[PDB]
Amino acid sequence: HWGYGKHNGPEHWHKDFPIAKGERQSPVDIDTHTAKYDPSLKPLSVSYDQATSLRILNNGHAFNVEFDDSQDKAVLKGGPLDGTYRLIQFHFHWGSLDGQGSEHTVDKKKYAAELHLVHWNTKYGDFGKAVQQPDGLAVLGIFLKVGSAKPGLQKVVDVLDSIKTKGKSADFTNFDPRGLLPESLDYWTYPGSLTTPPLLECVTWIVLKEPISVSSEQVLKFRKLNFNGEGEPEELMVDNWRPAQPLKNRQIKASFK
Ligand SMILES: [Zn+2]
Numbered sequence: 001h002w003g004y005g006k007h008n009g010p011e012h013w014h015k016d017f018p019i020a021k022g023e024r025q026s027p028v029d030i031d032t033h034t035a036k037y038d039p040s041l042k043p044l045s046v047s048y049d050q051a052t053s054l055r056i057l058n059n060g061h062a063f064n065v066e067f068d069d070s071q072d073k074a075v076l077k078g079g080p081l082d083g084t085y086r087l088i089q090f091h092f093h094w095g096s097l098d099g100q101g102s103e104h105t106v107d108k109k110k111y112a113a114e115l116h117l118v119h120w121n122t123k124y125g126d127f128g129k130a131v132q133q134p135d136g137l138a139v140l141g142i143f144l145k146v147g148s149a150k151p152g153l154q155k156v157v158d159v160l161d162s163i164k165t166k167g168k169s170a171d172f173t174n175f176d177p178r179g180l181l182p183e184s185l186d187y188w189t190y191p192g193s194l195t196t197p198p199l200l201e202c203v204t205w206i207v208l209k210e211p212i213s214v215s216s217e218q219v220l221k222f223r224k225l226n227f228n229g230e231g232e233p234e235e236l237m238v239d240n241w242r243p244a245q246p247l248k249n250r251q252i253k254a255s256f257k
Contacts, residue, residue: 002197003061003227005235010242017197024201025245026192027103030252035188038253044185044206045078046140046178051087053175056159060166060227061196062240064089065156065175069120069127074177076119076138079206079255080189085119085138088127090177092116093195094222096238098146103195103241104207106143111211112219113144114241115180116195134191136202142182142212149215152179157221165230182210186256195242209256 002013014020051074055066066089067074074087094113095101102111117140120130130136144150155175162170186209193201225237 004240013197013199017199019193019199019201022193022199022201023248024192024250025199026195026203026205027105027242027244028190028192028247028250028252029105029108029244030188030207032107035252035254037257038255041080041189041253041255042078043255044076044140044187046076046181046185048074048087048176048178050074051175051177053172053177055169056156056163056172057169058163058166058225058237060229062091062093062237063160063163063225064091065172065177072122076117076140076206079187080204080253081138081206082135084122086122087117087119087177090115090117090180092144092222093241094144094219094238095241096223096236098216098219100239101241102143103243104141104143104205105244111143112146113214113222115142115144115212116140117142117177117180131194131198131200131202133202135204137194138204138206141205141207142180143208144214144219145211146216146219147213149218150180150212152176153214153218157218160221160225164224165226165228165232167229180212182208182212184208184210186210186254188252188254190247190250190252192250209254 052068
C-alpha cells in the first residue's frame with residue numbers, strides 16, 4: 001500500500017522496503033558545482049529507430065508506455081555503459097504545481113516533471129533478473145519545464161482520458177520516443193536505484209542536462225489522471241515524485257565541461 005499520500009508516502013516506504021535507507025538511493029540532488037567532468041565518458045548512443053511501442057497502462061502510481069523488448073529494437077549504449085540496454089518502458093513523475101514534480105533536482109531546483117526511459121542490460125536475459133544486479137538497468141532521465149508545447153508528447157496526452165484510472169490500459173502502437181528528447185545529449189551520471197518500491201539499487205542513472213518544454217495544457221492533462229480505480233473516490237494523480245535522497249559515498253560525473 002505504498003503511494004504518495006498523506007500516510008503512505010516516501011517517508012514511510014522504509015518500513016516495508018528497508019533499502020529505502022540504503023547506500024545508493026535515488027533520486028539525488030545534482031550539485032553542478034561539485035559534479036566533475038569525466039573525460040573517460042562517451043557520448044550516449046540512443047538507438048530508437050526500430051522501437052515498437054505496444055500499450056499504455058495506468059498502474060496506480062504513474063502510467064507506463066510499454067515497448068517490445070524481446071529483440072534489440074530500441075537500445076541505449078555508450079556513455080557510462082558497458083553492453084546493450086533495451087528500452088522496456090517510459091513513464092513520468094509530475095507535480096500539482098509547476099514549481100515541483102521532478103525527482104532529481106539541479107542545485108536544489110525542482111522541475112515541473114521528469115521523464116524516465118527505463119532500459120535493462122541484455123546480458124541478464126530479462127527485466128526481472130536485471131533488477132537483481134547492480135548494473136542491471138540504465139534509466140535516461142529528462143527534466144520537463146512548462147513553456148512551449150512538446151509536439152512529440154501530444155499523442156501521449158491525448159490517450160490519457162482512456163486510461164484515467166488505475167488498471168486501465170490502451171493500445172499504444174507506433175509511438176516514437178525520439179520525439180521526447182531535447183537537442184543535446186549532455187548528461188550527468190551516477191549509480192543509484194529505482195525511485196519506487198522495491199527501490200532496488202540496480203540503476204546506472206543518466207540525467208540529461210537540457211530540459212524539454214511542455215505546455216501548461218499538456219501538464220494540466222497529466223494532472224487529470226487518477227491514482228484510484230474506476231468507481232472509487234477520485235484522487236488526482238499528482239505529486240508522484242520521491243524527494244532527493246542522500247548522496248552518501250557516490251560521485252556524480254558530467255559528460256560535458
Ligand atoms: Zn520513474
